[PDB]
Each structure stands twice: as structure tokens, then as C-alpha cells.
Design a protein around this ligand. Structure first.
Ligand SMILES: O=C(O)C1=C[C@H](O)[C@@H](OS(=O)(=O)O)[C@H](O[C@H]2[C@H](O)[C@@H](NS(=O)(=O)O)[C@@H](O[C@H]3[C@H](O)[C@@H](O)[C@H](O[C@H]4[C@H](O)[C@@H](NS(=O)(=O)O)[C@H](O)O[C@@H]4COS(=O)(=O)O)O[C@H]3C(=O)O)O[C@@H]2COS(=O)(=O)O)O1
Ligand SMILES: *[C@@H]1O[C@H](CO)[C@@H](O)[C@H](O)[C@H]1NC(C)=O
Ligand SMILES: *[C@@H]1O[C@H](CO)[C@@H](O)[C@H](O)[C@H]1NC(C)=O
Ligand SMILES: *[C@@H]1O[C@H](CO)[C@@H](O)[C@H](O)[C@H]1NC(C)=O
Ligand SMILES: [Cl-]
Lengths: 74, 385
């Protein structure tokens, strides 16, 4: 038989998650792609991203530790 | 395998404006492998970046290092947790001297808590825990290179996540009790994802289960690897089209609130039928304070029918059942919501997410190998007001 009874605990919240609980990353590796500006400029991608707001966007990954800021580069 | 490369002011601007225009909060990972002859962190490059960001008025949160447990393998440099902790203290002093003196700092972005990683996290938190705002760690279930379809559907694989979470909290509660714990990078499979699996409907069992368990167990934020990128585990592909996990994520966002409750199955079979319960998201215009959102995963090969308990048995329920669009079944990259394909309306417009109202008092139908959200209307749960 395939009918299942649920039990619910509803007396008080067991935990409180952030409003940004479901957040996302962009991998550091993407900033080595020649077309980074085209990619993240996409209005379509921004629309998709807005849908997950509020959220954190974390920029990082393995390449975090092999990237150096160079203020002169174009 | 890892060479140094540089990034520019332009790149920083691209990233910030993407986040800013999207309503997202940017967390930027700084390079921890810049070292003095003493093996201290050399902060000079981070200083350049901080000053630049300050000068543009960018509100940004910071991390330092990624998977420092792997530095010996990646770079032949070993940095112990104590030293890393001192490096975080130095970064925190720079932030306190910056234009954004209250900017947040997260770390240490360790991998999952194997014996050696657990010891590094422990010594890190003893040394640097006072200055981090949340503890970050990473989790992947499988190696993408060898992952199988069967692994994506296996509750014994899903269940391994529980033990990693418990180990992280054991370390944190022994050192910095009460500090928030975040999953700072997570996905199905590492090595960029499992080909033909991590970008499909079948990926959603892992994603939704991880969300459910994370919320249930006290994790405050989960960061999905990756929104957009070269790996198979992307939410959005290289044509800027959303994959099933995007649509799953959007539904979760719209329906699932911040207050976590609990559901379980009376039977106690409890492995292939997986159930989670929160208060409904109060920003959803359709629903009101006191409503509940149940979400469920059915990894059986037959339909299961769920019965709600008193006093919710006769309430109006809105169903949001996700199924793949054929012919590729679980390996599909397209999904339907209550029988309608989810697709962008145009480049600026997400579709509406249409509910299916059920007959009051009916049992909740959950087909084989599927997941669904169920909003219980007028539930009037005092804990959710
Ligand atoms: O998908 C590709 O484009 C791609 C295909 C290559 O085959 C693949 O190389 S691999 O098969 O030899 O691994 C490579 O994968 C990239 C991946 O595309 C990229 N993400 S992105 O968004 O698409 O740019 C990135 O992801 C990694 C994260 O940066 C990193 O924080 C985390 O760490 C893993 C660690 O890498 C992993 N080793 S492995 O990747 O070599 O297999 C280790 O075993 O687990 C870590 C997690 O620890 S934990 O489970 O204990 O928590 O995830 C990475 C990830 O693997 O996805 O880089 C990868 C790897 O690039 S590479 O140069 O190291 O090979 O590109
Ligand atoms: C840190 O790095 C910079 C640039 O690479 C170098 O010139 C500087 O002397 C270093 N600082 C220390 C304290 O070693
Ligand atoms: C950690 O590393 C530092 C810097 O290399 C070293 O001086 C210190 O003794 C190490 N701590 C432990 C516990 O080994
Ligand atoms: C479900 O799983 C079992 C595996 O033991 C199989 O024998 C059974 O026929 C399957 N049912 C369906 C409906 O495919
Ligand atoms: Cl079972």
C-alpha cells in the first residue's frame, strides 16, 4: 500500500534561516575567461539572478588563491 | 596545474555591477597564498583591492582563502589553522580601518570535515574565530568523473551529508559556541560536475534534499556552486538558459520561508520518501501569515500518497509538482510545473509559477522520482505569525 501519514511539529520554529538561505556562487575561474564582461553584462542573466534575490553571490573557488589584483591592467 | 593570473579594475566593476543590478550581496574571496618569508599572509595586494573598492563605494563582504586544507596539494605550501587564524585577524584590522568598517568577514572555507580538515578548522577557530561573522565550509557528495545516475537517486548517498554537518557543528560547538555556520560552496559533484547528470532534473533530488537537511540541522546559508560557469553543476547554461535546478531554486525562493519546522513519516520507512516543513515565505503575495510550506522528495519507483495530519487535513492545499519534460526522463534539461513547461517569457520576464489547487481533504500525490512543494493555506500556525 502506497498511502503514508505525515506528522508535523509546528509549536515553535526549530531554526531560523537567513532570508538569503538559498545563495549562489560565481567561480573565480570565470574571471580568467576573455569574455567575462560580456557574460556578466548579459541582461538575460541579470533577470535570472534577480529572481533569486535576496541572496549572497560568492566569488571564489580554487582560483581564489591564484588571482592577483593588478590596478594598471586594462 | 595552477598558475598565477591577474585581474583588473574592469573585472571588479563587472562583478560588482552584476551583483548590484541583480539585488545580490557580493562576497569576494581574497588570495591567501601571498606569503612573507616568515610564512605570514602578505596583505599588500588585498590592501590595493580594499582601497579601490572603498574608492568606488562598493559594499562588499570578504573571505580569505579557499580550501586551505588542500594548499599543500595545490601549491606545495602548508599553512596550519593557527597561522590562518592570525591571517584573518590581520585582514579584520584592515577592514576596521577601511571606509566600510563594519564589513563582514567569513571563513575559512574548508572542505568537508575529514580528520585533517577537522583539526585545521578547530585550530583556525581557536585562533581566528573571534573575527569571523560566520563559519564557512564546503560539501560535494561525489567525484563528477565517476558519479553514476544511480548515485544521484540513492538515499544512502544523500544521507552522507548528515554526518558531515554533524561533524562541523561538533567542531564549532567545542570552540566558538553559537557562531553561525554557512555552506560556502556546495554541489552534487566536484571536478566541475557529473557529465549529463549535474545539469539535469535528476540533480534536483540532491539539491532539494541538501536544502531541506541544511535548514533542518541549523545551517543558516547555503551557497550553490555555480550560478553560471563552465561546470555541469551550473544553474544557467552557456546560452543563458535556465536548467531544472534554476527553476527548483526559484520555486524554493518563492515558497519556503525562514522559519524551519519538522515533518516526518508515521510509518518510519523514512529513506526514499523525504519530507521537510517550513512556514510559507511571507513575501509571496498569494499566501498569508500562518501558512505552511511542505516539500517532499519521492525516490521510490511508484507514486506515494501523503495524508496531512489534524488540524490540517481539510485545508486548501496548493501543489507545485515538478516533473521532467520528455523524452529524456530524469536526464532531461527541461522541467514542467504542474504539467506546464517552465520557460522564460522573454529575456526580461520570468514566467508566473502557477499552482494547482487540490480538492480539500485529498491526499497529496507524489509520483515516482519526483519532488513537489505543497502550500497549506489558512493553516493559521501561530509559530508562523
Ligand atoms: O567543467 C569544466 O569546465 C572542467 C572540466 C575539467 O575536466 C575539470 O577538471 S577535472 O575533471 O580534472 O577536475 C575542471 O573543473 C573545474 C570547474 O569547472 C570549476 N568550476 S566552474 O564554475 O565551472 O568554473 C572549478 O570548481 C572547483 C572549485 O573552484 C573548488 O572550490 C572546489 O574544490 C574541490 C576540488 O577541486 C576537488 N578536486 S578536483 O576538482 O580536481 O576533482 C576536491 O576533490 O574537492 C574539492 C571540494 O572539497 S570537499 O568535497 O571536501 O568539500 O570544487 C571544484 C570542483 O571540482 O568543482 O574548478 C574545477 C576543477 O578544475 S581543475 O583545474 O582543478 O581541474 O574544468
Ligand atoms: C608583499 O608583497 C609585495 C608585492 O609582491 C612586496 O613588494 C612586499 O615587500 C611584500 N611584503 C612583505 C612584508 O614581505
Ligand atoms: C603553525 O605554523 C606557524 C607558522 O609557520 C608555526 O610557527 C607554528 O609553530 C605552527 N603551529 C603548530 C601548532 O604547529
Ligand atoms: C520497483 O523496484 C523493484 C526492484 O526490486 C522492481 O522489481 C519493481 O518491479 C519496480 N517497480 C516498478 C513499478 O518499476
Ligand atoms: Cl527504503
Amino acid at each position: 500500500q502506497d498511502v503514508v501519514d505525515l506528522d508535523f511539529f509546528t509549536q515553535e520554529p526549530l531554526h531560523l534561516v537567513s532570508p538569503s538561505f538559498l545563495s549562489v556562487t560565481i567561480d573565480a575561474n570565470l574571471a580568467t575567461d576573455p569574455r567575462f564582461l560580456i557574460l556578466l553584462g548579459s541582461p538575460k542573466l541579470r533577470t535570472l539572478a534577480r529572481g533569486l534575490s535576496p541572496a549572497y553571490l560568492r566569488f571564489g573557488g580554487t582560483k581564489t588563491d591564484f588571482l592577483i589584483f593588478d590596478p594598471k591592467k586594462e | 596545474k595552477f598558475k598565477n593570473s591577474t585581474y583588473s579594475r574592469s573585472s571588479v566593476d563587472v562583478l560588482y555591477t552584476f551583483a548590484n543590478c541583480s539585488g545580490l550581496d557580493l562576497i569576494f574571496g581574497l588570495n591567501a597564498l601571498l606569503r612573507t618569508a616568515d610564512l605570514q599572509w602578505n596583505s599588500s595586494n588585498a590592501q590595493l583591492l580594499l582601497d579601490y573598492c572603498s574608492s568606488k563605494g562598493y559594499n562588499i563582504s570578504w573571505e580569505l582563502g579557499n580550501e586551505p586544507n588542500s594548499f599543500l596539494k595545490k601549491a606545495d605550501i602548508f599553512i596550519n589553522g593557527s597561522q590562518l587564524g592570525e591571517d584573518f585577524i590581520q585582514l579584520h584590522k584592515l577592514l576596521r580601518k577601511s571606509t566600510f568598517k563594519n564589513a563582514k568577514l567569513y571563513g575559512p572555507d574548508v572542505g568537508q570535515p575529514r580528520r585533517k580538515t577537522a583539526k585545521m578548522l578547530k585550530s583556525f577557530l581557536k585562533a581566528g574565530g573571534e573575527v569571523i561573522d560566520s563559519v564557512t565550509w564546503h560539501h560535494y557528495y561525489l567525484n563528477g568523473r565517476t558519479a553514476t545516475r544511480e548515485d544521484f537517486l540513492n538515499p544512502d548517498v544523500l544521507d552522507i551529508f548528515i554526518s558531515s554537518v554533524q561533524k562541523v557543528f561538533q567542531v564549532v560547538e567545542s570552540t566558538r559556541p553559537g557562531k553561525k555556520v554557512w555552506l560556502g560552496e556546495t554541489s552534487s559533484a566536484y571536478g566541475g560536475g557529473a557529465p549529463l547528470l549535474s545539469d539535469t532534473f535528476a540533480a534536483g533530488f540532491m539539491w532539494l534534499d541538501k536544502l531541506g537537511l541544511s535548514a533542518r540541522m541549523g545551517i543558516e546559508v547555503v551557497m550553490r556552486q555555480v550560478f553560471f560557469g563552465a561546470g555541469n553543476y551550473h544553474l544557467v547554461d552557456e546560452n543563458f538558459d535556465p536548467l531544472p535546478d534554476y527553476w527548483l531554486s526559484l520555486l524554493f525562493k518563492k515558497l519556503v520561508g525562514t522559519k524551519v519546522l519538522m515533518a516526518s513519516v508515521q510509518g518510519s520507512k523514512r529513506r526514499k520518501l523525504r519530507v521537510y516543513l517550513h512556514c510559507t515565505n511571507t513575501d509571496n503575495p498569494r499566501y498569508k501569515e500562518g501558512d505552511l510550506t511542505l516539500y517532499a522528495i519521492n525516490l521510490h519507483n511508484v507514486t506515494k500518497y501523503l495524508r496531512l495530519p489534524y488540524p490540517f487535513s481539510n485545508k486548501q492545499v496548493d501543489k507545485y509538482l515538478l516533473r521532467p519534460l520528455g523524452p529524456h526522463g530524469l536526464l532531461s534539461k527541461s522541467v514542467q510545473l504542474n504539467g506546464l513547461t517552465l520557460k522564460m517569457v522573454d529575456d526580461q520576464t520570468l514566467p508566473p509559477l502557477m499552482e494547482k489547487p487540490l480538492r480539500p481533504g485529498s491526499s497529496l500525490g507524489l509520483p515516482a522520482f519526483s519532488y513537489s512543494f505543497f502550500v497549506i493555506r489558512n493553516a493559521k500556525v501561530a509559530a508562523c505569525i
